[PDB]
């Protein structure tokens, strides 16, 4: 399946793509303002994610650091990124269908739209100014708006036991972005698409 990743932000981002234990395609690449990078994701990929990283430096071997979304200091991500990270999430060819969503469970760094480029289903978007409106206690000094599990490490925010409810913090993310997951047990905003659809992830869509 193809995913076109487009940076409409005014600043450079380093895109990343991983399924947690391996890179998807090359795993990461720099996108200057306006640039597009198309990756190929194997059919059947379960639990894949795409995100933006900000304020990165990499040496000529591909090793360095980013202030949001860093994946073990690699340009070409093999693992998931360090919060805060707005997440485009997907599982492909699961009993004939694809499933997509956007999640704020690991915080928010960059606004995003995640839409199919083929027929049969709708896209989802979280493009509100979550960083600007972020509650004081969730602001990350390194940049972005952390989720409450990252900040406070409680069973209630991290849903450790699989029993948890909404919180003042989760309701902030849900108010600004109703169509994204705000906590682990949120009422799902997953979209079902035809199996083998293709997609576009756009950073700073508005």
Residue 200 CB, nearest approach to Na ion (Å): 4
Of residues 98 and 101, the one with the C-beta less far from Na ion: 101
Cβ 15 vs Cβ 37: under 8 Å: yes
Min CB(201)–Na ion separation in Å: 6
**What x-and-dash track marks residues 38-67 binding Na ion by CB under 5 A?**
-------------xx---------------
> Distance between CA atoms of 39 and 25, rounded to whole angstroms?
6
Select the span of 18-26, 34-42, 95-103, 129-137 touching Na ion (CB under 5 A): 95-103
Site track for Na ion across 98-137, x = CB under 5 A: ---xxxxxx---x--x-x--------x-------------
Integer angstrom CA distances of residue 142 from 19, 21, 33, 69: 25, 26, 21, 11
Residues in contact with Na ion, counted by CB under 5 A, come to a total of 23
Span 168-197, contacts to Na ion by CB under 5 A: 170-171, 174, 182, 189
Q: Which helix (H) or strand (E) covers residue 125, if one does?
A: strand 124-126
Query: Which residue carries 């079902």 as its tokens?
Result: 192
Radius of gyration for the chain, computed over Cα atoms and rounded to the nearest angstrom: 16
């Amino acid at each position: 399946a193809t995913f076109e990743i487009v940076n409409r932000c005014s600043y450079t981002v380093w895109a990343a793509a991983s399924k947690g234990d391996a890179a998807l395609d090359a795993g990461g690449r720099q996108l200057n303002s306006g640039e597009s990078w198309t990756i190929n994701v194997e059919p059947g990929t379960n639990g894949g994610k795409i995100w933006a990283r900000t304020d990165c430096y990499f040496d000529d071997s591909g090793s360095g650091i980013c202030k949001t979304g860093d994946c073990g200091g690699l340009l070409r991500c093999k693992r998931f990124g360090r919060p805060p990270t707005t997440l485009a999430e997907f599982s492909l060819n699961q009993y004939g269908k694809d499933y997509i969503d956007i999640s704020n469970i690991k915080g928010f760094n960059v606004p995003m739209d995640f839409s199919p480029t083929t027929r049969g289903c709708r896209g989802v978007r979280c493009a509100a100014d979550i960083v600007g409106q972020c509650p004081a206690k969730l602001k990350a000094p390194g940049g972005g708006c952390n989720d409450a599990c990252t900040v406070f490490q409680t069973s209630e925010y991290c849903c450790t036991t699989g029993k948890c409810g909404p919180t003042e913090y989760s309701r902030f993310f849900k108010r600004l972005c109703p169509d994204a997951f705000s906590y682990v047990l949120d009422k799902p905003t997953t979209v079902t698409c035809p199996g083998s659809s293709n997609y576009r992830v756009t950073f700073c869509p508005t």
